[PDB]
């Protein structure tokens, strides 16, 4: 009842990639139970960024996942207290980007506070030379670990000319709600398609959309 059919969000983001500091803010809305959302983003400090904006995409919203098949919803359950997440994304060419995030609910609006720290993105690689074209769809595996959930995914970043640069995500999701007030899910999977809808001014304005649907494995079992 705290998370309604349509929800708005406001976001603040600050961090560094290699040696370059920046801040963003964003606002948007979506449908938490249908698992769709839109964010309109502004780089408000340090723009234009010297790196492809694509590497920030996953840092801009776990409340908007359609949890199907009765999967207990760790994220929606966490309100009013909210939750946090922390992640390491490792690119196969040396870039590493960590991020920590706080998610709260204030006067009916979701509030995100995110911090980014990326290092060792190769100065002559596709991210620094802006040869990227957004992400392929992906499937994240989530599983309970230590009272929270952990997530694992490999994502494919499309490159100019075809071809991909791969990265791996390891995420820890922590609820701010007491564990005895949470019904934990078993292992499940989130199918996701994160898409750049619009951009302008050398990526200092960006519009992103995501659709995300959670499910069990639907293959028959011999056991």
Numbering used by the authors: 3 to 62, 66 to 228
Pull text from the paper.
Fluorescent proteins have facilitated major breakthroughs in modern molecular cell biology. They are widely used for studying biological events, such as cellular trafficking and endocytosis, and have contributed to the development of innovations such as multiphoton microscopy, genetically-encoded sensors, and super-resolution microscopy. mKate, a derivative of eqFP578 from Entacmaea quadricolor, is a bright, monomeric, far-red fluorescent protein with excitation and emission peaks at 588 nm and 635 nm, respectively. Structural characterization of mKate under different conditions revealed the pH-dependent trans-cis isomerization of its chromophore, a discovery that further aided the development of mKate variants with enhanced optical properties. Using a structure-informed approach, we introduced a minimal set of two mutations in the chromophore environment of mKate. The first mutation, S158A, has been shown to destabilize the trans conformation of the chromophore, whereas the second mutation, S143C, was intended to impact the cis conformation.
At high pH (pH 9.0–10.6), this variant appears blue under ambient light, with absorbance and emission maxima shifted to 598 nm and 646 nm, respectively. In the structure of far-red-emitting GmKate (pH 10.0, determined at 1.8 Å resolution), only the cis-conformation of the chromophore was observed. The absorbance peak at 598 nm is indicative of the anionic form of the chromophore, similar to the state observed in mNeptune. Indeed, the π+-π stacking interaction between R197 and the chromophore is conserved at pH 10.0, and may further stabilize the deprotonated state of the chromophore. Chromophore-interacting residues reside in positions similar to those observed at neutral pH. The green (pH 7) to red (pH 10) shift of the absorption energy of GmKate can indeed be attributed to the change in protonation state of the chromophore from neutral at pH 7 to anionic at pH 10. In contrast to mKateS158A and mKate, GmKate has a ∼10 nm red shift in absorbance and emission maxima at pH 10. In the chromophore region, the only difference between mKateS158A and GmKatepH = 10 is the loss of a hydrogen bond due to the substitution of the S143 with a cysteine. This hydrogen bond may stabilize the highest occupied molecular orbital (HOMO) that has electron density concentrated on the phenolate motif. The loss of this hydrogen bond would thus increase the HOMO energy, which results in a decreased energy gap between HOMO and the lowest unoccupied molecular orbital (LUMO), causing a red-shift.
